[PDB]
């Protein structure tokens, strides 16, 4: 109802850097908010694409940002009669960036890895890796839980069981409040998908440079399966956390599997042991149901609700004609030991190829009325197709069909304005939460401010 569209702020990365592909609010120990922006195609110091991360401090004027430094040197270790190899070229560092307490976790989903042993190899494959940074101290750690030292043949001999070679760890990421990092790896287990989790604390204390293969004893990976429903499902394309079992002591995980069951797509709700609590099946094939997932209480009853994004959804029209507009599904959580049911509301896009529901961002209580609000991205929406982000205020009955406010891309065609979103953080300290929107195509991030 009250995000100011005129008083914008633009943070700008370098050309072709995809600055704003990912973003998040970050808070230092003193309490000061800044913005973390991931730029997965930033050039390295030797003119090769490695990706990067920038840590912008809040400024009304905005502008250029300082680079959060990471080691971009490839590594080799000849140990245990093998050769371990990291490859950071085209790794896409900052394809996802999440903040927790005084730590930042930027991931390079396409970081490759290989192991040589005599004339044999594990195969050069994108395991992924996350770089962790503690800015006010300067500490750095890594986490690459899909790296192995198993040779190509042994996988073939075991019908590719437990094949983590193509994980793309950090493809998606989230951190629980307690400090459990949760990484989506949709290429895990020959493209079934997997989740890897570990305490941030333990990732740090078990990391040393040069080791490459090491143990985070407290970590917990999800499971391999031979059920064809999960094949090529990209389980973990998106990930989020919330409370869905009544037990405040446990944390529940929401996983996105957009091509699950022959491109029907699904989103699952699991406990921290990766046991299924509920499954939400997609509506229409190839709609990518599960591209985006969001958790927030929108009807003000204290129980978290769930939002799923199917951005390639095709709506029916006159003369049996389908039209790709995108769709967001809202599931309110009921009381007692009751599962999520059918959708409480369906929000469909209006612009063709708009990819409505490509992003879904909880805004907190934007207008301070009691009910939490959200933003839904249509990155190629609006009559011109330059992009659009629609605000939706919450209410007792759930959400509104009619958006409260629409924001149009101030950037040129192609910016993907909306492809990333983050909110529920008061950046300027005026008492109202704000919203940062990314436009990786334009290499920029717009900041919108909430006003009385």
């Amino acid at each position, epitope marked *: 109802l009250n995000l100011d569209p005129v008083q914008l702020t633009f943070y700008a990365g370098p050309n072709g850097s995809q600055f704003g592909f990912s973003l998040d609010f970050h808070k230092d120990s003193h309490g000061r908010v800044a913005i973390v922006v991931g730029a997965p195609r930033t050039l390295g110091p030797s003119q090769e694409e490695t990706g990067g991360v920038f840590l912008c401090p809040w400024r009304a004027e905005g502008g250029q940002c300082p680079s959060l430094l990471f080691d971009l040197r490839d590594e080799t*270790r000849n*140990v*245990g009669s093998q050769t371990l190899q990291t490859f950071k070229a085209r790794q896409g560092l900052g394809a996802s960036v999440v903040s927790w307490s005084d730590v930042i976790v930027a991931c390079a989903p396409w970081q490759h890895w290989n192991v040589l042993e005599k004339t044999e190899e594990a195969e050069k494959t994108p395991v992924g890796s996350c770089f962790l940074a503690q800015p006010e101290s300067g500490r750095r750690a890594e986490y690459s839980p899909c790296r192995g*030292n198993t040779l190509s043949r042994i996988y073939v001999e075991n019908d590719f069981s437990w094949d983590k070679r193509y994980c793309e760890a950090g493809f998606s990421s989230v951190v629980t409040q307690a400090g459990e990092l949760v990484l989506g790896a949709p290429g895990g287990y020959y493209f079934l998908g997997l989740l890897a989790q570990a305490p941030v604390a333990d990732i740090f204390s078990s990391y*040393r440079p*040069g080791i490459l293969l*090491w*143990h985070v004893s407290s970590q917990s990976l999800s499971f391999d399966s031979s059920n064809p429903e999960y094949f090529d499902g990209y389980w973990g394309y998106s990930v989020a956390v919330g409370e869905f079992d009544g037990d405040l002591n446990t944390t529940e995980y929401v996983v996105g599997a957009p091509t699950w069951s022959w491109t029907l797509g699904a989103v699952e709700i699991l406990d921290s042991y990766y046991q299924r609590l509920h499954r939400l099946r997609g509506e229409q094939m190839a709609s990518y149901f599960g591209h985006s997932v969001a958790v927030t209480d929108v009807n003000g009853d204290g129980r978290h609700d769930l939002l799923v994004g199917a951005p390639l959804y095709m709506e029916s029209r006159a003369d049996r004609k389908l039209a790709e507009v995108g769709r967001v599904y809202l599931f309110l959580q009921p009381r007692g030991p009751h599962a999520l049911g059918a959708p409480s509301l369906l929000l469909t896009g209006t612009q063709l190829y708009g990819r409505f529901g490509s992003a879904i961002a909880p805004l907190g209580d934007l207008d301070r009325d009691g009910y939490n609000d959200i933003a839904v991205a249509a990155p190629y929406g609006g009559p011109s197709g330059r992009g659009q982000v629609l605000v939706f205020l919450g209410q007792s009955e759930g959400l509104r069909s009619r958006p409260s406010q629409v924001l149009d891309s101030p950037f040129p065609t192609g910016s993907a304005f909306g492809f990333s979103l983050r909110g529920a953080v008061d950046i300027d300290d005026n008492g109202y939460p704000d919203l940062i929107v990314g436009a990786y195509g334009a290499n920029q991030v717009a900041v919108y401010r909430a006003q009385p």
Partner: antibody
Amino acid sequence: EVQLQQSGAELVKPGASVKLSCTASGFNIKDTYVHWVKQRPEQGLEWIGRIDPANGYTKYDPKFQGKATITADTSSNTAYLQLSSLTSEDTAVYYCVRPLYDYYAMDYWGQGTSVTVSS
Amino acid sequence: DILMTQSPSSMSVSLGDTVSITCHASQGISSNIGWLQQKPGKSFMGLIYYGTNLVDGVPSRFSGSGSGADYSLTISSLDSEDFADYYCVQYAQLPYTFGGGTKLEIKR
């Protein structure tokens, strides 16, 4: 608290076999490689081999290939060293070992098991 | 098989001294070296892994150094607890191979 609890001292006969145990406490035996190491006063320390109990795969020093068979059981969290065709050269103290972080390291050791071969 | 020659086999030293043990590999092992301690009659404790990293809980006074095929363990300000045996192990190649040992002994 990581701790490897090895089995008690064995008095055994030449020609016979013995099987030593090493049971994980404060962790699961499948979490890392588990190694076996031989120690004697004069000859010193010798690496016998390793096992990855997740999948049972093993490596050995050619010296002990034929004598030593390393195995493990995730159900009981225990690794095992079996020595066939016992000789007086096998009279040693035997340790199981595992790393802390680095996959390939030798950081945490069991208390050691003494084997005495004698008629 | 890499050979690990450890020097000296024993040294007579006093409390408070800074001593160093050296370990020479038959070929380069790019920091893939651990150092171990065996106290009299007791079992083993890990001191260093990957050349310079202390195992959790090992006191600051222990330190690893070196590169290529030549490495050194340094104990600074010797404690009466530090009069034990010390071994290097390499894990660059299987089979893993150990040093001969160095025994710290009380000078008098």
